[PDB]
């Protein structure tokens, strides 16, 4: 098979999975151009740390109707952005839950910019994460943020790790 | 690791990046660039009747930028030269030790078209015989050109092919 996916997506029309991929790859000063006519976009990334190295793809899949059999079989992590300023912010993730149950990825991250008392506050985000098996991450909290996403992905045992 | 098809150029007339745009048939490409805006990695999923393989087209402007990881991954080599100049083939000499050391099955010397006032067909062919390259003309007078490059790359046994 091919290399693993970390599937990256967004439930907001005003922040894309591609932009989140740019922040993640930015942790190592990698600049990415995201303009492809392909409906799904794969960005290669060599995870390298003191334990192992692993080639993966950050797979930007804008909606569930773009999940092929091949993509589904490769998903080993799931990162999903939601708009916590909207009261419907968690409801907007609901369409991904059947797929997340099927994939059973060992890293599942729910990402917002900052929890919000008139939108989705910390308590409600945390209860959702308990029920569905996600970790809550804030990109701009009042490790955390994109560094925590990178940390969590570096602590994943990918199917193709090469141990040091 | 993920294979590289290393694409480069010895002439400012036509850069490795332009060569990739022509090989992939579009300018709208996902591309990962390093902090120094020098080595460009273009992901590409080859898919044919025999296999599917997700590789990188790696535009490496000069031999100094061939890291250990790039060197390890090179499984095809494509280099443009300016055939209108009598010194056109001399401009490629820098790459010969590395191409000798990588052992790629695809080694392609590319020009727009051979020229009797620069590097003509005989001299280009004699150079290709001595160093084990294949001569390709993008714009011949008479597969050829970019279609032949794509054919050769699809007939290469990458280290990560997924057989159909």
UniProtKB/Swiss-Prot annotation, chain A:
Cell compartment(s), UniProt: Cytoplasm, Cytosol
GO annotation, biological process: protein transport
Keywords of the record: Cytoplasm, Palmoplantar keratoderma, Phosphoprotein, Protein transport, Transport
Q: Give the chief site where it resides.
A: cytoplasm
Q: In which tissues is it expressed?
A: Widely expressed, including in skin and keratinocytes, with highest levels in adrenal gland, rectum and thymus.
GO cellular component terms given for this protein: cytoplasm; cytosol; nuclear speck
Protein role: May be involved in endocytic recycling of growth factor receptors such as EGFR.
Q: Which disease is it linked to?
A: Keratoderma, palmoplantar, punctate 1A: An autosomal dominant dermatological disorder characterized by multiple hyperkeratotic, centrally indented, papules that develop in early adolescence, or later, and are irregularly distributed on the palms and soles (other palmoplantar keratoses have mostly diffuse hyperkeratinization). In mechanically irritated areas, confluent plaques can be found. Interfamilial and intrafamilial severity shows broad variation. In some cases, PPKP1 is associated with the development of early- and late-onset malignancies, including squamous cell carcinoma.
How the protein assembles, per its UniProt entry? Answer: Associated with AP-1 and AP-2 complexes.
**Can you say what this protein is called?**
Alpha- and gamma-adaptin-binding protein p34
> What is the phylogenetic placement of the source species in the record?
Eukaryota, Metazoa, Chordata, Craniata, Vertebrata
Section of the entire sequence shown: 3 to 177 of 315
